[PDB]
């Protein structure tokens with residue numbers, strides 16, 4: 001009865017079966033179902049979607065319509081009463097660097113992107129949602145509750161547009177709405193290279209046959225490369241300072257300039273590509289541009305994989321790591337490699353790891369100038385501080401030397417994100433990421449908290465007292481019950497993140513299961529996984545085994561002092577060493593001798 005499936009707005013596929021390299025789109029990874037993991041298809045549904053009308057309308061759309069007999073609470077009221085806090089003193093994670101937060105965002109952006117519907121071009125339909133807050137079609141505005149401070153200074157709502165969905169981009173009325181993943185599900189550096197042939201070519205430097213990615217020609221970082229500007233008007237990064245008039249960057253991923261540390265990480269990875277490509281040109285002078293591009297691309301892909309799977313996931317998942325992602329046993333072509341709709345909310349655990357300030361540090365790892373520490377809200381879409389205020393190096397030192405925010409049941413999301421978020425088009429530092437996440441949860445038709453607990457083989461609390469035992473927090477459980485009325489109706493984003501963290505990790509049991517399962521699948525179901533026999537030679541793999549994040553910094557900045565375990569909390573100068581003592585990526589195994 002379940003159909004072979006739709007796909008009129010998704011194009012053709014034809015697959016070069018000899019090809020030792022990934023496609024840009026993700027097509028052809030899986031030989032029996034070539035579209036599996038490819039960009040611009042439906043996110044996978046691990047559980048049936050749950051919408052108000054069975055099909056497409058989110059819970060909370062129709063005021064009289066309940067969920068399980070109760071009204072769903074406003075996203076912004078859940079934000080105000082649970083997610084927020086005032087005192088930033090004491091929130092910092094004593095054993096994770098700020099790099100730990102930032103790598104999470106990098107990895108997330110490699111795997112999933114569900115962009116807003118395209119309806120407001122040649123059309124003030126976006127402007128009208130904003131201006132008048134009238135719910136309809138793809139406008140699904142986040143209404144302020146009665147006592148909200150923003151009601152006084154900001155109007156009736158925050159605008160919000162429904163995520164794009166496959167088949168039609170107007171609505172459909174027979175099968176349930178499926179949102180699109182616009183990037184490749186494989187952990188494949190698509191955030192560097194693009195997920196679309198169009199973008200991917202535009203990012204390359206073809207002017208020369210050196211397999212280089214294109215770089216900024218207007219500005220340089222003390223001789224080091226910046227990303228090229230995106231010259232597409234209008235631009236949010238110009239808007240945040242019209243006197244500086246520095247545009248956003250153009251990268252493999254649309255979101256690269258959303259905050260200055262992300263743009264920073266993107267810069268390092270672009271540098272790493274060009275550097276690898278130059279080093280390969282030396283070792284194999286006979287290689288053409290396509291060859292060089294592909295081979296650097298492939299190494300960078302492996303780099304992301306290793307840092308993610310060897311260094312990042314164990315310190316997120318802790319004791320549950322082995323339970324969900326056992327040691328690798330090879331490529332299983334029966335595994336679904338697709339990112340699930342629910343993972344795209346699970347991985348938003350990072351939002352509770354983002355701290356209120358970003359610092360620039362000098363070569364002694366001491367404050368850099370008089371405005372060294374800045375509030376995070378002043379750095380959304382901010383390229384001008386990079387270009388006109390010291391380049392990336394002082395930012396990278398902050399990444400190493402400052403700390404991530406630790407998630408806290410009484411201090412979930414900093415007001416920098418919770419009250420001051422800037423979104424493009426819209427003019428103000430006045431949005432709420434937490435409210436947006438909850439509204440999105442609904443937009444995407446997510447099953448509730450207890451449906452996912454059941455999925456993960458965990459208990460399903462029905463009462464206040466049951467919820468108190470699961471959360472190990474009486475007061476939080478009590479606010480959730482007062483808002484949601486039953487635990488079944490608690491939005492997964494908030495329920496998942498309300499759980500106390502597992503031992504040695506930074507997420508609770510439910511999230512560790514949703515994340516662990518996904519990463520297991522992105523590893524096991526990828527034909528081009530770096531450790532799958534034949535992707536790299538045995539010797540290449542011995543060389544790739546030594547990648548570190550420290551080495552990445554050494555090779556692509558003018559920073560000479562680095563920790564060995566860059567994700568742990570590290571204090572200068574004690575936990576820092578000279579770049580000369582840190583293992584290098586030895587590219588000798590890529591010398592292809594053929595005479």
Ligand code: HEM
Nearest residue numbers: 101104105108112113114259344347348350351354436440
């Ligand atoms: C200053 C730091 C960050 C900012 C400003 C930020 C901002 C945002 C914004 C605006 C969205 C879109 C919300 C929506 O429309 O539904 C979003 C989505 C997301 N964020 Fe963050 N974020 C940050 C850090 C992180 C971190 C550290 C992680 C993970 C470790 C993360 C994971 C995600 C994910 C998974 C999504 C959904 C992506 C998709 O499929 O579309 N973010 N973030």
Ligand SMILES: *[C@@H]1O[C@H](CO)[C@@H](O[C@@H]2O[C@H](CO)[C@@H](O)[C@H](O)[C@H]2NC(C)=O)[C@H](O)[C@H]1NC(C)=O
Nearest residue numbers: 240241242243244245246378384385387388389
């Ligand atoms: C917009 O960018 C300008 C350009 O960098 C910023 O002005 C700089 O800031 C201080 C003065 O307070 C000086 O050290 C720089 O030399 C300034 N340059 C210029 C041209 O004035 C300005 O602070 C930014 N404005 C905002 C609102 O972000």
Ligand SMILES: *[C@@H]1O[C@H](CO)[C@@H](O)[C@H](O)[C@H]1NC(C)=O
Nearest residue numbers: 205207208212213214215217
């Ligand atoms: C392309 O590469 C050449 C040779 O390295 C370089 O001089 C030129 O600036 C590059 N162009 C861009 C846009 O990166």
Ligand SMILES: *[C@@H]1O[C@H](CO)[C@@H](O)[C@H](O)[C@H]1NC(C)=O
Nearest residue numbers: 329331332333334335336524
């Ligand atoms: C391959 O995947 C399928 C479904 O996930 C599973 O039945 C099988 O156990 C997997 N193979 C191995 C070797 O684990």
Ligand SMILES: *[C@@H]1O[C@H](CO)[C@@H](O)[C@H](O)[C@H]1NC(C)=O
Nearest residue numbers: 094095096315565567568569
């Ligand atoms: C800090 O984190 C590392 C992993 O980065 C861990 O092995 C170490 O034991 C942790 N230190 C403390 C004090 O918990």
Ligand SMILES: [Ca+2]
Nearest residue numbers: 110184186190
């Ligand atoms: Ca990807």
Ligand code: NA
Nearest residue numbers: 533537538539
């Ligand atoms: Na062997």
